[PDB]
Amino acid sequence: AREITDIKQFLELTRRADVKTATVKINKKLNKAGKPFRQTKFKVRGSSSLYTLVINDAGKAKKLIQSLPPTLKVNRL
Amino acid sequence: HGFYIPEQKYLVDKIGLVKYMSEKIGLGNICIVCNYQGRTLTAVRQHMLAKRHCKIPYESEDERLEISEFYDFTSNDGIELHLPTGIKVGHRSLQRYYKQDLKPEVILTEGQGTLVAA
Amino acid sequence: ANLRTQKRLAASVVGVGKRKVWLDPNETSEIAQANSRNAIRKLVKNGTIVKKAVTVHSKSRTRAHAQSKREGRHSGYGKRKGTREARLPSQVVWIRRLRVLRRLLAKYRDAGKIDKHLYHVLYKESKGNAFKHKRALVEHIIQAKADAQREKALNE
Amino acid sequence: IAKTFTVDVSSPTENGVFDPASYAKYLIDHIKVEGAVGNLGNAVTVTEDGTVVTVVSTAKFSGKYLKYLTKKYLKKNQLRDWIRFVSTKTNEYRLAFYQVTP
RNA sequence: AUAUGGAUUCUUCACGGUAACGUAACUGAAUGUGGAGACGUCGGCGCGAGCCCUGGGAGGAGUUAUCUUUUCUUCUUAACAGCUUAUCACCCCGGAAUUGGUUUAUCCGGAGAUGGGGUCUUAUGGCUGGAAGAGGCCAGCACCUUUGCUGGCUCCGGUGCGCUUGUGACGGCCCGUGAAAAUCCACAGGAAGGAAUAGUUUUCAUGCCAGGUCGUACUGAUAACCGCAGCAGGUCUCCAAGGUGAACAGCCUCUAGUUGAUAGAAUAAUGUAGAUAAGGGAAGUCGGCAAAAUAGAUCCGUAACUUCGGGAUAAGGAUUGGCUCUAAGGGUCGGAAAAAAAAAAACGAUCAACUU
RNA sequence: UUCAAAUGAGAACUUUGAAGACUGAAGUGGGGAAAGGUUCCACGUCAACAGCAGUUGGACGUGGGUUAGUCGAUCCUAAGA
Ligand SMILES: [Mg+2]
Ligand SMILES: [Mg+2]
Ligand SMILES: [Mg+2]
Ligand SMILES: [Mg+2]
Ligand SMILES: [Mg+2]
Ligand SMILES: [Mg+2]
Ligand SMILES: [Mg+2]
Ligand SMILES: [Mg+2]
Ligand SMILES: [Mg+2]
Ligand SMILES: [Mg+2]
Ligand SMILES: [Mg+2]
Ligand SMILES: [Mg+2]
Ligand SMILES: [Mg+2]
Ligand SMILES: [Mg+2]
Ligand SMILES: [Mg+2]
Ligand SMILES: [Mg+2]
Ligand SMILES: [Mg+2]
Ligand SMILES: [Mg+2]
Ligand SMILES: [Mg+2]
Ligand SMILES: [Mg+2]
Ligand SMILES: [Mg+2]
Ligand SMILES: [Mg+2]
Ligand SMILES: [Mg+2]
Ligand SMILES: [Mg+2]
Ligand SMILES: [Mg+2]
Ligand SMILES: [Mg+2]
Ligand SMILES: [Mg+2]
Ligand SMILES: [Mg+2]
Ligand SMILES: [Mg+2]
Ligand SMILES: [Mg+2]
Ligand SMILES: [Mg+2]
Ligand SMILES: [Mg+2]
Ligand SMILES: [Mg+2]
Ligand SMILES: [Mg+2]
Ligand SMILES: [Mg+2]
Ligand SMILES: [Mg+2]
Ligand SMILES: [Mg+2]
Ligand SMILES: [Mg+2]
Ligand SMILES: [Mg+2]
Ligand SMILES: [Mg+2]
Ligand SMILES: [Mg+2]
Ligand SMILES: [Mg+2]
Ligand SMILES: [Zn+2]
């Protein structure tokens, strides 16, 4: 239902102890400049709602994939 | 204007394909396509620019016979047609008979066949 | 064989009218065996069944008669039916004329062209159908500033 | 700004029925640029190596247009119904046969 | 049900803002007041939705003797949440006759206008999430009681007295002023309750469990209802495509849906339904009964009489195709061995309408 | 309305394809209320019924089919009882 912006507070949510699952989705889009890029969305299912962060930056994104808990179940794509 | 010389590859007389075309607008004062007859060089000239004909048609098979010298050319059943490579090509009326795949040949096992012959 | 049902499911699966459904007449033994949607599914993609093309309603003729209309093609009295009013109501041409002037005069007030005194007359004057159209207005304005410089230049 | 379109005439040509010469003779004459024919302002480029035809233009032009002048040239030479114009990938188009038998 | 976080307190029940009010919260019994619930009708304007029309581009079909950058079609985004957006109103500064502002509609201002700067309702829209992973359209592969799998592309805008509808601010009318309650919340009140080694709170975030009973098919009518029937009757409403045209009229087409109402062969009289007729024009008949003629529009002209509003489309004349033109009418932005089988390493620009 | 094919002891009437037409958005289209009560759907079937026919059917015979915290009833009150 909702979108998250701040990543530091996004990470807390990544534990929360009740968040069992999540997923990593990749979208080919093209910017205002009309050039193809990869924006990625991080979706973490909470109990009653589902948060999704939008990283239009692939790098700070793909290392955040290296920022995730070993506990989490990730559905890739 | 759009003037194009067909098969620039093959031309012998191309400096004389210029003289046969300037004889259409030069003396008798004729359009290269229409048959339209201007009274003056202005007329045929004003017109070529009008309905837009700068092109000497190569598609007309009588036009290949007329302009033939100034070139050097160097060495339907209704169902299927027959190509030089061995091809049998289909027709656009059957397009949905083509696209449709059908049942495979139904083929019995030595187990099933045997029991059916018996 | 009785193929009614197979034609019904075809409209539903394809999601198109029974009009537009094709059943291969040569396939009439195979289509017989369909009897369920997911089977029809296979048949639909297979090509034994096909959704037929939409019959054509072409607008080219209207677009022609439409194009010519905007060249002032047939305005003729014999081409008219309704009253002048019912065709383009008077009130409407008015609310055009009015809003054109009020927006006009407004613009001038602000850009320095006319002060709020010349504005207030013209407003009250226009609303009385003292102006035919937008050019007729600017004319009365320039005649209003020209004489004001005819009452200014003799006071000097 | 330039857009470039590409058509592959290989399939029908190699099998004997087609002439990229005439095809590229036709396109040049029948493209309409801001008006009637023959008007390519060095805004439209038709050139070919014989297994393919290139189309490059700064003038108004489209994928559909290239398909329209394609289908029209065929019916003129009656290669219609023996050949159909398909899009292999966006803006690069290929000429093909419906049924191919040995 | 409740637990964690956040907030609040030694100035106990928070702070900011001149104000309109603002926020993630910020004790409040009896009882009292107040709001929503809660309401005509018509008119014309304002706005939004879907539809309709329409340019460019990416697909796919159709037509091509000749012609047409062509004709048709796919190009979609839900409830919910977050940021943002409005007419009405209201707030501070200001103090206005040279009377100004201003609606299509003439209303408002020292009981404080114009003008300047702000606040708010969030109806409605815009971005983001939901959400491309869905669906849709093109090209492929295999598979036949496996079932699926693979690739591509889903794009960017325009116009308006248009249509349907929602809604807003107003207006006309009434000896007509166009429901009630359930329900919910607010405020007044200050009972009562409680901090400093700790306490209060669930109108804040998050987290946990639960949601009963019955209706749920199809018809809704030229065959499912009532007319003794599979009867030309009767029976309450929603959505509503293009063209003609004033038009939800008639006339033709698209999306969908029928092609079902015993058939063949003939073509007399009588018929029923439908048409036309020379010269005459009601001489027919109880009676112009029936039919005929007149009709749309734009212009010109329009009597006695009248309760002065009408009468009046009075009466009565002229024009109406097609085609090429002319002029007028706007918006935005810039000034063990052998053989064999088998298995594995005042301008200027631009934009778009029609209507006369 | 017409032509072919299919099915069939049998075809003017069933099924499919083809062509021609009609309703023409105030519809012969898509959904409901009242009333109907299984008429919906499928496999079988043609004595009787569908004022001709019948291989088809709202017929006959055997079965399957209606899933709600959010749509309704339920609660509230209106004229009244
Ligand atoms: Mg009108
Ligand atoms: Mg009109
Ligand atoms: Mg008026
Ligand atoms: Mg009230
Ligand atoms: Mg879209
Ligand atoms: Mg969205
Ligand atoms: Mg919302
Ligand atoms: Mg998005
Ligand atoms: Mg997809
Ligand atoms: Mg509009
Ligand atoms: Mg209505
Ligand atoms: Mg239902
Ligand atoms: Mg109905
Ligand atoms: Mg009836
Ligand atoms: Mg009875
Ligand atoms: Mg309606
Ligand atoms: Mg219409
Ligand atoms: Mg209409
Ligand atoms: Mg039938
Ligand atoms: Mg009858
Ligand atoms: Mg007579
Ligand atoms: Mg006569
Ligand atoms: Mg007479
Ligand atoms: Mg008499
Ligand atoms: Mg008599
Ligand atoms: Mg009488
Ligand atoms: Mg009469
Ligand atoms: Mg009279
Ligand atoms: Mg008259
Ligand atoms: Mg005339
Ligand atoms: Mg019949
Ligand atoms: Mg009709
Ligand atoms: Mg009719
Ligand atoms: Mg029906
Ligand atoms: Mg229904
Ligand atoms: Mg049935
Ligand atoms: Mg049966
Ligand atoms: Mg019978
Ligand atoms: Mg019988
Ligand atoms: Mg039964
Ligand atoms: Mg639940
Ligand atoms: Mg409810
Ligand atoms: Zn010519």
XYZ file of C-alpha atoms (C1' of nucleotides) and ligand atoms in Angstrom, chain F residues 43-45 57, ligand 37:
5
model
C -25.047 -37.027 -21.235
C -28.924 -40.060 -23.023
C -33.573 -39.637 -26.100
C -35.996 -27.696 -27.773
Mg -28.607 -33.556 -25.865
